[PDB]
Structure formats: C-alpha cells, structure tokens
Amino acid sequence: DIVLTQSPSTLSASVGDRVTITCRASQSISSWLAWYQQKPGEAPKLLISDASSLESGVPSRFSGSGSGTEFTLTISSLQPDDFATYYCQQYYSSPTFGGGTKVEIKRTVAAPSVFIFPPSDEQLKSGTASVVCLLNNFYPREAKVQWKVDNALQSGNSQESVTEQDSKDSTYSLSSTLTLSKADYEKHKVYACEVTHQGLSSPVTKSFNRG
Amino acid sequence: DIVLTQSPSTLSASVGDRVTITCRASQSISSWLAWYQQKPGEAPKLLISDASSLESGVPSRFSGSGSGTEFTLTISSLQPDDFATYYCQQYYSSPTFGGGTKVEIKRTVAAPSVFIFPPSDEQLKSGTASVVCLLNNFYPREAKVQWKVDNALQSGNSQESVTEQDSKDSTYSLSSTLTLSKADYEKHKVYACEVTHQGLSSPVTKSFNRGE
Amino acid sequence: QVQLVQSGVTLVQPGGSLRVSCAASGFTFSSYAMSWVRQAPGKGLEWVSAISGLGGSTYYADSVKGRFTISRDNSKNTLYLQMNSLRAEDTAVYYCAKDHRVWAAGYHFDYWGQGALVTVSSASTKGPSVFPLAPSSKSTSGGTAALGCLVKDYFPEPVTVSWNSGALTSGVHTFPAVLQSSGLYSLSSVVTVPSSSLGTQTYICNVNHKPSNTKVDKKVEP
Amino acid sequence: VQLVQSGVTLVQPGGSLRVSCAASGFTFSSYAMSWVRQAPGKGLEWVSAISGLGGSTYYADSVKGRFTISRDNSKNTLYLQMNSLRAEDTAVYYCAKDHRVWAAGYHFDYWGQGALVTVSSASTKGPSVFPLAPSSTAALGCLVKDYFPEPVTVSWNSGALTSGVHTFPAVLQSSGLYSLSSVVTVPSSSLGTQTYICNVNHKPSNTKVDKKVEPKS
C-alpha cells in the first residue's frame, strides 16, 4: 500500500517564524491529500484539504503546495495557537497517518540539572529495587542518558519519561527509572547516572555508594 | 570487591585549557593511587604515582591531588600530545581500572552529511540484505540514529561505528548498518533513516523505496 | 452544529467483547459517510474501519478485519462499533468522524469525536505503592535540593498527585506513566526547593488512585 | 629498558597458547612482572602477576582456573601459558615492569607493545565485496561482508584517491563474522567521467578483489 514519510519529526521554532514541513509519500496520490492538526489530548482538527483548498475557519497564514509525490505545508507567520502535532493523510490507496510532526519553542540553550536518588528503604522490603535519575530544566528536549553500574553499561533495564514544556520556564524535564531485583542491587556497590546534553560541554555524572 | 568511578567520560577541551578529571573510589584507599595515559593503538603510559610523586621524563604541567576517598587530576595547560584515553588505578584492593576519560577537540559544531544506501544486488543474490546509513563530517561527536521502516522503529537489528578524529579537519564520522533477511526486506517497501544531531535544528531523515 | 458524543470510559479482558456508541447530532446523518480512527498511546493515528451513507458497504483494515464490526442506524442517528476477541494491540483512543467536503464520496474527515479509550490489559486493579525519594545532599550544590515521590504497581490509569494538598504548586513536575513488563503502570513526581527550606518545611505528596480507591500521603525525609 | 611481546597469534575455543614477553636493557630478577589485557573498545584488565623472585604467583578470580604464569630470570623471559581459552579472553596482552617499588608493589611505568590473541574460532573465508551506488557533491562506497579474520586493507584505485576517503572500524556480527565499510565523497560532475574501483587486500584468506562502482538505474 501507500505509506508517507515526514522529514522533521520534531521541529524547533519560535513565534513569527516561517515554518515548512515536507510530507512525501511513496506512491503518487496526485492532488488528493490532507493535513491535520492535533493538540495533545484534543481531537485532530482538519487544517487543509486537497493540499490546495483551505478548509473554512482556518487562519490565512497557513498555506500548502506541491504536486505528485512531493508536498509542502508552509506558514508565513507562526502563532501560539498553531503549536500541535501534525499528521498528513493520503486516502488514495491505503489510508494511513505519518509519525507526526511536533513543533516546539527553542529560545535559548540550557544545562540540565542532575539529581540522583537511591532506592527507598520501604521498597527494599518488597524485593524490587528502583533507582531514579532526574534531569530538570533543560532545553532542547533532545538528550542522551546512560546507566553505569560498577562500571557496567545496562541496556534494556532502563525506562524513561518526559514532561511537556512548562509554560513558565519553557524547559523540558526528564525522568529515568532503573528497575532491578534486590540481589543484583546488593551485589553492585556503586551506581552512576551519566548525562549528555547540549548545554554542558562535558557530560556530567552523578553517582552514589550503597548504604 | 572495590570499584572506582570516573565523572567525565568524554571531556571536550582545547589546547592550553586547565583540565580537571575527578576519580572517586567506593572505599577509602588513602594515598595509594595512580593515573595512566593511552593513545590510540599505543601501549599505556604512566602519568602519576601515589597521587603526589611524578614519574621521570614526564612533562611538568600535569599534577594530581586528593586523599582518602577523593582524588583529582589537574592539567594547567593542555597540549597536542594530551589527546588520549585516561584511566585511574588503586592498589589497595583488586587491581581495577576506571571507565576512562577520552579527550577530544570538537569545539566546532558541524552539520552531519547524511547519505542512505540500499543493499546491492549481488548481496540480494546472496540472500542477505544490508541497508547502510552514513553520517559524515560531524563534530560534535554525540549523535543518535534511529531506523524507521514504514514508520516503525527497529531496535536490536542495527549496528553502529564511529571513526577517530581526523587530524586535518578534526571531524568524526559514523556509520549505521541495518541487516535483514531477503523476505523481511521484500515484505516492507519503504526504508528510512532518522538522524538526530546538534548541528541541525530539525533532525533530518533520508529514505528510499525498495527497488527504486 | 455538528456534535459527536463518544462513549465515556471502557475497560476489557483478553478476547473480550465491547460495544462503542458514537452519537451524532446537529447535522444530517445518512447524508455523509462515517469512520473510526484509533490512536495508540504515544503513537500516530491509525485508520480502523468505515461505513457508507446507506450502511450497505463496509470497509475494514487488514489487521482488524476478522473480529471487528462497524454498523449504523439512520433512524436513531447512531454509529455502533462492536469489537470482539480483543487484544492488547487494539488498546487505543477511538474517534468517530464525518466527511469534510465529499458527500459519501471520499475519505476526508472534518469533525472528530472527543474520543473513547479502550484498554485490553486485563490485569487486576491493585493499590499503588508509594516510595519517597530521599534528598541527595543537605548541601545546596545545585541551588535547590530535589526530592520526589514514586508510585509503583498501580492499575489502571489515572493517578493524581498533589503536594501539601496543593500548597506546593510551583516547581512541580509530574512525569507520564510508563508501561512495565509486569503490565503494571508506574509514575514519578518530583520537586526542587531551596536547601535552607529543607529543615523548616515538611513535604508530603498526596497519591490518589480511583479504581482501587487508594489515597495515601507520603512524607519525604532523609 | 625495553619489553617485547609476541607479534601475532590465533587460537580456538579452549585452546592453548603461549605469550612470550622478552625483557632487556635493565635488571630482570630484581623486579616483579605482570600481564594486563585490553579488549577492543574496553578499559584495561589485570590478568596475572608473579613475584620478582617467582615464589609467589597471583591470578584473578575470572582467570585463576584456566591461566598459568611463569618466568625464567636467566633468559630474562616471561611466559603466559593460556589454557581453556574463551571468547571473552580475546584481547591484546601487555607485559609490564615496575615503576617505583622493588618486588614489593605492582606499579607500572614501562609497557610492552602488546601481543594480539584471538579466540573467535571462525573458519577463514574470503570477504564478499558489495558496491554502494551514488544517488541523484555525491558519496559512493564499498562493503566488505562475512570476512575472517582481521585485518582488511582498503584502497581506492590502488590508492590513487587518498583524499576524502573514510575507512570505518571493523564490526562484530552475531554470526561471529566481521564486516567492514569504506566510502568516498566526490563532486557530482566527476562521477561520470571517472571510474572508481575499490581494492580489498586480505592476506589470510588471500583474497584480493577489485570491485568497480557504477551508478545505474
């Protein structure tokens, strides 16, 4: 069937910036295509139809063009209401939605605050151990964090979650949870969390000793 | 037993910059500690002993300090010969080496060149398919590359490699290889490679259609 | 005037049967052609099935074709999606929509329903375990000491967490829940406050879990 | 005051191999020697130690079972007899001498160049050369697949194109078969008028194949 692809997954931008997204598909769907807008937790809203005709009630700043395989959505002036995840739908052969293009606000570059927290004592009684690494107040959202236990990399046992930008600081915050059995924990004495981000030239590591 | 840890694994620095690496042991090993130097493909070289006494034939700029649990290696001025991997060793217990701190000169930001190649036909004749995604001429060194097949992430089937910094341009190069069976390749039509790097404001993706 | 009112909330078991009711009002029903679209959590939208202005021709996706059924009533102005033999892959937010321009001719969609969540986890609902995050150093090496609260082994979503009965609104970060191998959700919430304030103030997080009806407050101490 | 390890060595699983570290230019028996191994892309690891006199031998927990260290002060030579080899034991082995302490401690100032030991146990086979065609400045390449063992030397037009050339490090596959990739970047116009041929020289397999690169549709 037909599956489209989008070049920017997360596109950093600011207010009043000219923004262009490319939604190029595999096959030729001709002039029949549509672009949508989905805010988080909100139902998707139709942005544009046939890639040429604008749906009514949509602000005039939005425009779209391209023919055949190549398509481009262009905004001359960016606005606060215009920030949402963006998908493009083709109905020509098989209908499907892309990965989506989320747009954000990158105004400065900041260094992540790093805090490492040991497993609590009440949890130790359960037989399950969780170590928590906190990164606070850092944009851009992109970052890379590695887990090192007694100088050993751990893959597959780490889980991560990201909050949305707080409107106040416009900074993302990330949490990493490492879950392992109690025994594996008492065998290893030293636990370390490594943080690699744009704000810091040198990747900063926060570690602790057992007990 | 006892294992020590290093704070900077990769430290971005420049010539003549004051550099400090911090190595803290789990237990208190007092004053018995050593620091080493290893250049690529070269044998490990002794930097400092007992954390206070310097070896003969060694440049005077390097110094070390700290007692008990805490230790610090400080270089007042960095030199072209200082870009190599550095480890810390404690003789109190089990001979043990740190993760190491690699020194690099990628002060400059470069945009990665992205080129995506489909598997060759002879390889298809072999019954094995390999798609190659190329990142060229980029520092800083940090990067993240994800494989997307028909808007679907692929994990575990990717292998990656990074070249060393070139002396002339000071740029690192990275390659990612996705290997799949003939059937698994032919079932899925579109193959895409997503590149995430600092140089680019928007993470750039290059893709191709099978048999195109 | 077009309004679509979806089913509020739903939960199922493995291979279970469930009906989704999507009410439509404020506009001609039989006139347009309707369709359902599901969004898996943290995933792009996925087209499921569609039904015609008469209801004579139905269309389904390859993955959903076996055990799913879409249907419509021109009289009660109601769209029903009957789903049988459910699996975890089908766990998603479902939306029923209407055609944008074409009159039962094309697959454009202008108005979507608020959405109905369907979860096929089939795990017993149990109270969350609350584990405090001890402050790291008493010394303010970061300008602000950080402390937190960890919720583990709770099911199902959601869980709401407010500090000091809402007294601490600022500098609070509530991270999204994560799926574990055990299939039981876990969430983490943190706060950063000045170190001097550590001795004089007490920080308690109020964990509210509706299904197991478990509400426990846990103070953070080193 | 120089040490000389074994040049090159190759083995099989559970196999036996001797690494000989020659010592010269300074007094031997006076000091205590030790072995230290370095796995590719990994930190150093302490293997075995022997007292300067030779009365006391010391081994690591992982290696104590299957390794044996021995010395002759007369020949000024250190032998590491390695038995029951495993894939984890594949490494470059260095033999060192003491920095300050005299047969009392395990400091190291002067290191040997290293002796390569490989326990991969794969049949030596010729590399498969697969060309990578240009799109549409443009990039083109060559892929070496399922080759064993190291090394593989890569040259363009028998080395005519030295500039703008990148040879990536070898990678281990699950099959235990190495694979390597080499690329070059040249202007878009020069691609048609010039022919680019990659030379892969593999000595153990005696495989020398030259593969031309063409962008065809």
Coordinates of N, CA, C and O in Angstrom, one line a residue, chain B residues 1 32 34 36 38 41-46 48-50 53-56 87 91 94-95 97-99 115-120 122-123 126 128 130 132 134-137 159-163 166 169 171 173-175 177 179, chain D residues 36 38 42-46 61 94 99-100 105-114 129-135 137-141 143 145-146 163-174 179 181 183-185 211:
Chain B
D1 N 34.1 -6.9 45.3 CA 35.2 -6.1 45.8 C 35.0 -4.6 45.6 O 33.9 -4.1 45.7
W32 N 47.2 5.7 48.1 CA 47.7 4.8 47.1 C 46.9 4.8 45.8 O 45.8 4.2 45.8
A34 N 47.1 5.8 41.2 CA 47.9 6.1 40.0 C 47.1 6.5 38.9 O 45.9 6.2 38.8
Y36 N 47.1 6.9 34.5 CA 47.8 6.4 33.2 C 47.3 7.2 32.0 O 46.4 7.9 32.0
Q38 N 46.8 6.4 27.6 CA 46.9 5.6 26.4 C 46.4 6.3 25.1 O 45.2 6.6 25.0
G41 N 46.0 2.8 19.8 CA 47.0 1.8 19.2 C 48.3 1.8 19.9 O 49.2 1.0 19.6
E42 N 48.5 2.6 21.0 CA 49.7 2.7 21.7 C 49.6 2.1 23.1 O 48.5 2.1 23.7
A43 N 50.7 1.6 23.6 CA 50.7 1.0 24.9 C 50.5 2.1 26.0 O 50.8 3.2 25.8
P44 N 49.8 1.7 27.1 CA 49.5 2.5 28.2 C 50.8 3.2 28.8 O 51.8 2.5 29.0
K45 N 50.7 4.4 29.1 CA 51.9 5.2 29.6 C 51.6 5.7 31.0 O 50.5 6.3 31.3
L46 N 52.6 5.6 31.9 CA 52.4 6.0 33.3 C 52.4 7.6 33.5 O 53.4 8.2 33.1
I48 N 51.1 9.3 36.8 CA 51.5 9.7 38.2 C 51.3 8.6 39.2 O 50.4 7.7 39.0
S49 N 52.1 8.6 40.2 CA 52.2 7.6 41.2 C 52.0 8.1 42.6 O 52.5 9.2 42.9
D50 N 51.3 7.4 43.5 CA 51.0 7.9 44.8 C 50.2 9.2 44.9 O 50.0 9.8 45.9
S53 N 53.7 12.0 43.7 CA 55.0 11.9 43.1 C 54.9 11.6 41.6 O 54.2 10.8 41.1
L54 N 55.7 12.5 40.8 CA 55.7 12.4 39.4 C 56.8 11.5 38.8 O 57.9 11.5 39.3
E55 N 56.5 10.8 37.8 CA 57.5 10.0 37.1 C 58.4 10.8 36.2 O 58.1 11.8 35.7
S56 N 59.7 10.3 36.1 CA 60.7 10.9 35.4 C 60.5 10.9 33.9 O 59.9 9.9 33.3
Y87 N 42.9 6.7 32.4 CA 42.3 5.8 33.5 C 42.9 6.1 34.9 O 44.0 6.7 35.0
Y91 N 45.7 0.4 44.2 CA 46.3 -0.8 44.6 C 45.9 -1.3 45.9 O 46.3 -2.4 46.4
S94 N 41.8 -5.2 44.7 CA 41.8 -5.8 43.4 C 42.2 -4.7 42.3 O 41.7 -3.6 42.3
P95 N 43.3 -5.1 41.5 CA 43.7 -4.1 40.6 C 42.5 -3.8 39.7 O 42.0 -4.7 39.0
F97 N 40.5 -0.8 37.0 CA 40.7 0.4 36.1 C 39.3 1.1 35.9 O 38.3 0.4 35.9
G98 N 39.4 2.4 35.8 CA 38.2 3.2 35.6 C 37.7 3.2 34.2 O 38.3 2.6 33.3
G99 N 36.5 3.7 34.0 CA 35.9 3.8 32.6 C 36.8 4.5 31.6 O 36.8 4.1 30.5
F115 N 23.8 10.3 4.0 CA 23.7 9.5 2.8 C 23.1 8.1 3.0 O 23.7 7.4 3.8
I116 N 22.0 7.8 2.4 CA 21.4 6.4 2.6 C 21.5 5.5 1.4 O 21.1 5.9 0.3
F117 N 22.1 4.3 1.6 CA 22.3 3.3 0.6 C 21.5 2.0 0.8 O 21.6 1.4 1.9
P118 N 20.8 1.6 -0.2 CA 20.1 0.4 -0.3 C 21.1 -0.8 -0.5 O 22.2 -0.5 -1.0
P119 N 20.7 -2.0 -0.1 CA 21.6 -3.2 -0.3 C 21.9 -3.4 -1.8 O 21.0 -3.2 -2.6
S120 N 23.1 -3.8 -2.1 CA 23.5 -4.1 -3.5 C 22.8 -5.3 -4.0 O 22.3 -6.2 -3.2
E122 N 24.1 -8.0 -5.8 CA 24.8 -9.2 -5.5 C 24.5 -9.7 -4.1 O 24.5 -10.9 -3.9
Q123 N 24.3 -8.8 -3.2 CA 24.0 -9.1 -1.8 C 22.6 -9.8 -1.8 O 22.4 -10.6 -0.9
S126 N 22.9 -13.1 -2.7 CA 23.4 -14.0 -1.6 C 22.3 -14.4 -0.7 O 22.4 -15.5 -0.1
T128 N 21.0 -12.1 1.6 CA 21.1 -11.3 2.7 C 21.0 -9.8 2.3 O 21.5 -9.4 1.3
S130 N 21.5 -5.7 3.4 CA 22.0 -4.8 4.3 C 21.8 -3.3 3.8 O 22.3 -3.0 2.8
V132 N 22.6 0.7 4.5 CA 23.6 1.4 5.2 C 23.3 2.9 5.3 O 23.0 3.5 4.2
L134 N 24.8 6.6 6.4 CA 26.0 7.2 6.6 C 25.9 8.7 7.1 O 25.2 9.5 6.5
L135 N 26.7 8.9 8.2 CA 26.8 10.3 8.7 C 28.3 10.7 8.5 O 29.2 10.0 9.1
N136 N 28.6 11.8 7.9 CA 29.9 12.2 7.6 C 30.2 13.6 8.0 O 29.4 14.5 8.0
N137 N 31.5 13.8 8.4 CA 32.0 15.1 8.7 C 31.2 15.9 9.8 O 30.6 16.9 9.5
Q159 N 23.6 -1.9 13.8 CA 25.0 -1.9 14.3 C 25.6 -0.6 13.9 O 25.4 -0.1 12.8
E160 N 26.4 0.0 14.8 CA 27.0 1.3 14.6 C 28.5 1.4 14.8 O 29.0 0.7 15.7
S161 N 29.2 2.3 14.1 CA 30.6 2.5 14.3 C 31.0 4.0 14.1 O 30.5 4.7 13.2
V162 N 32.0 4.4 14.9 CA 32.5 5.8 14.8 C 34.0 5.8 14.5 O 34.8 5.1 15.2
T163 N 34.4 6.6 13.6 CA 35.8 6.7 13.3 C 36.5 7.7 14.3 O 35.8 8.4 15.0
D166 N 39.9 13.0 12.7 CA 40.9 13.2 11.6 C 41.8 14.4 12.0 O 41.2 15.5 12.5
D169 N 40.9 18.0 9.6 CA 39.6 18.7 9.7 C 39.0 18.6 11.1 O 38.0 19.3 11.5
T171 N 37.1 16.1 12.3 CA 35.8 15.6 12.2 C 35.6 14.1 12.4 O 36.4 13.4 11.7
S173 N 33.3 10.5 12.0 CA 32.3 10.0 11.0 C 31.7 8.7 11.6 O 32.3 7.9 12.2
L174 N 30.4 8.6 11.4 CA 29.6 7.5 11.9 C 28.8 6.7 10.9 O 28.3 7.3 9.9
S175 N 28.8 5.4 11.0 CA 28.0 4.5 10.1 C 27.1 3.6 10.9 O 27.4 3.0 11.9
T177 N 24.5 0.2 10.2 CA 24.1 -0.8 9.3 C 22.9 -1.6 9.9 O 22.9 -2.1 11.0
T179 N 20.8 -4.9 9.1 CA 20.8 -6.1 8.4 C 19.5 -6.9 8.6 O 19.1 -7.2 9.7
Chain D
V36 N 48.7 -7.5 31.6 CA 47.5 -6.7 31.6 C 46.8 -6.8 30.2 O 47.4 -6.4 29.2
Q38 N 43.9 -5.9 27.2 CA 43.0 -4.8 26.7 C 42.1 -5.4 25.6 O 42.6 -5.8 24.6
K42 N 37.5 -1.4 25.2 CA 37.3 -1.6 26.6 C 38.5 -1.1 27.4 O 39.6 -1.0 26.9
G43 N 38.3 -0.9 28.7 CA 39.3 -0.5 29.6 C 40.3 -1.7 29.9 O 39.9 -2.8 29.5
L44 N 41.4 -1.4 30.4 CA 42.4 -2.4 30.8 C 41.9 -3.3 31.9 O 41.1 -2.9 32.7
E45 N 42.4 -4.6 31.9 CA 42.0 -5.5 32.9 C 43.3 -6.3 33.4 O 44.0 -6.8 32.6
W46 N 43.5 -6.4 34.7 CA 44.6 -7.1 35.3 C 44.4 -8.6 35.1 O 43.4 -9.2 35.5
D61 N 40.2 -13.7 39.8 CA 39.1 -14.6 40.0 C 38.6 -15.3 38.8 O 38.3 -16.5 38.7
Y94 N 49.5 -7.1 27.3 CA 50.7 -6.3 27.5 C 51.4 -6.8 28.7 O 50.8 -7.3 29.7
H99 N 57.2 0.5 38.4 CA 57.5 1.9 38.3 C 58.5 2.3 39.4 O 59.6 2.8 39.1
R100 N 58.1 2.1 40.7 CA 59.0 2.6 41.7 C 59.4 1.5 42.7 O 60.6 1.2 42.9
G105 N 55.6 -3.9 45.3 CA 54.4 -3.5 44.7 C 54.2 -3.6 43.2 O 55.1 -4.1 42.5
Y106 N 53.0 -3.3 42.7 CA 52.6 -3.6 41.4 C 52.4 -2.4 40.5 O 51.6 -2.4 39.5
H107 N 53.1 -1.3 40.7 CA 53.2 -0.1 39.9 C 53.7 -0.5 38.5 O 54.5 -1.5 38.3
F108 N 53.3 0.3 37.4 CA 53.8 0.1 36.1 C 54.2 1.4 35.3 O 53.4 2.2 35.1
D109 N 55.5 1.5 35.0 CA 55.9 2.7 34.2 C 56.1 2.4 32.7 O 55.6 3.1 31.9
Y110 N 56.7 1.2 32.4 CA 57.1 0.9 31.0 C 56.3 -0.3 30.6 O 56.4 -1.3 31.2
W111 N 55.6 -0.1 29.5 CA 54.7 -1.1 28.9 C 55.2 -1.7 27.6 O 55.8 -1.0 26.8
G112 N 54.9 -3.0 27.4 CA 55.2 -3.6 26.1 C 54.2 -3.1 25.1 O 53.2 -2.6 25.3
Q113 N 54.5 -3.4 23.8 CA 53.7 -3.0 22.7 C 52.3 -3.8 22.7 O 51.3 -3.3 22.2
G114 N 52.4 -5.0 23.2 CA 51.2 -5.8 23.2 C 51.2 -7.0 22.3 O 51.9 -6.9 21.2
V129 N 32.5 -8.7 -1.5 CA 32.6 -7.2 -1.8 C 31.3 -6.8 -2.5 O 31.0 -7.2 -3.6
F130 N 30.6 -5.9 -1.9 CA 29.3 -5.4 -2.4 C 29.4 -3.8 -2.6 O 29.6 -3.1 -1.7
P131 N 29.3 -3.4 -3.9 CA 29.4 -1.9 -4.1 C 28.1 -1.1 -3.7 O 27.0 -1.5 -3.8
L132 N 28.4 0.2 -3.2 CA 27.3 1.1 -2.9 C 27.2 2.3 -3.9 O 28.1 3.2 -3.8
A133 N 26.2 2.3 -4.7 CA 26.0 3.3 -5.8 C 25.5 4.7 -5.3 O 24.7 4.8 -4.3
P134 N 26.0 5.8 -6.0 CA 25.6 7.2 -5.8 C 24.1 7.6 -6.2 O 23.6 7.0 -7.2
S135 N 23.5 8.5 -5.5 CA 22.2 9.0 -5.8 C 22.1 10.1 -6.8 O 23.0 10.3 -7.6
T137 N 28.5 17.4 -5.4 CA 28.8 16.5 -4.2 C 28.0 15.3 -4.2 O 26.7 15.3 -4.4
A138 N 28.6 14.1 -4.1 CA 28.0 12.8 -4.0 C 28.9 11.8 -3.3 O 30.1 11.9 -3.4
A139 N 28.3 10.8 -2.6 CA 29.0 9.8 -1.9 C 28.9 8.4 -2.5 O 27.8 8.1 -3.0
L140 N 29.9 7.6 -2.6 CA 29.9 6.3 -3.0 C 30.8 5.4 -2.2 O 31.7 5.8 -1.5
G141 N 30.5 4.0 -2.2 CA 31.3 3.2 -1.3 C 31.4 1.7 -1.7 O 31.0 1.3 -2.7
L143 N 31.3 -2.3 0.4 CA 31.0 -3.0 1.6 C 31.7 -4.4 1.6 O 31.5 -5.2 0.7
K145 N 31.8 -8.0 3.5 CA 30.9 -8.7 4.4 C 31.4 -10.2 4.7 O 32.0 -10.8 3.8
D146 N 31.1 -10.6 5.9 CA 31.4 -12.0 6.2 C 32.8 -12.4 6.0 O 33.1 -13.4 5.3
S163 N 42.6 11.3 -0.7 CA 41.9 12.3 -0.1 C 40.4 12.1 0.0 O 39.9 11.4 -0.9
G164 N 39.7 12.6 1.0 CA 38.3 12.5 1.1 C 37.8 11.0 1.2 O 36.7 10.7 0.8
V165 N 38.7 10.2 1.8 CA 38.4 8.8 2.0 C 38.2 8.4 3.4 O 39.1 8.7 4.3
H166 N 37.1 7.6 3.7 CA 36.9 7.2 5.1 C 36.8 5.6 5.2 O 35.9 5.0 4.6
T167 N 37.7 5.0 6.0 CA 37.6 3.6 6.3 C 37.2 3.4 7.8 O 37.9 3.7 8.7
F168 N 36.0 2.8 7.9 CA 35.4 2.6 9.2 C 36.0 1.4 9.9 O 36.4 0.5 9.3
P169 N 36.0 1.4 11.3 CA 36.5 0.2 12.0 C 35.6 -1.0 11.8 O 34.5 -0.9 11.4
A170 N 36.2 -2.2 12.0 CA 35.5 -3.4 11.7 C 34.5 -3.7 12.8 O 34.6 -3.2 13.9
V171 N 33.4 -4.4 12.5 CA 32.4 -4.7 13.4 C 32.1 -6.2 13.6 O 32.2 -7.0 12.6
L172 N 31.8 -6.6 14.8 CA 31.5 -8.0 15.1 C 30.0 -8.2 14.9 O 29.1 -7.5 15.3
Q173 N 29.7 -9.3 14.2 CA 28.3 -9.7 13.9 C 28.0 -10.8 14.9 O 28.9 -11.4 15.5
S174 N 26.7 -11.2 15.0 CA 26.2 -12.3 15.8 C 26.8 -13.6 15.3 O 27.2 -14.5 16.1
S179 N 32.5 -7.5 9.5 CA 32.0 -6.8 8.3 C 32.6 -5.4 8.4 O 32.5 -4.7 9.4
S181 N 33.1 -1.4 6.2 CA 32.6 -0.5 5.2 C 33.5 0.7 4.9 O 34.1 1.3 5.8
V183 N 34.1 4.3 2.4 CA 33.4 5.3 1.5 C 34.3 6.5 1.0 O 35.3 6.8 1.6
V184 N 33.8 7.2 0.0 CA 34.5 8.3 -0.6 C 33.4 9.4 -1.1 O 32.4 9.0 -1.6
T185 N 33.8 10.7 -0.9 CA 32.9 11.7 -1.4 C 33.6 12.6 -2.5 O 34.7 13.1 -2.3
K211 N 36.6 -4.2 -7.0 CA 35.2 -4.0 -7.5 C 34.9 -2.6 -7.9 O 35.2 -1.6 -7.2

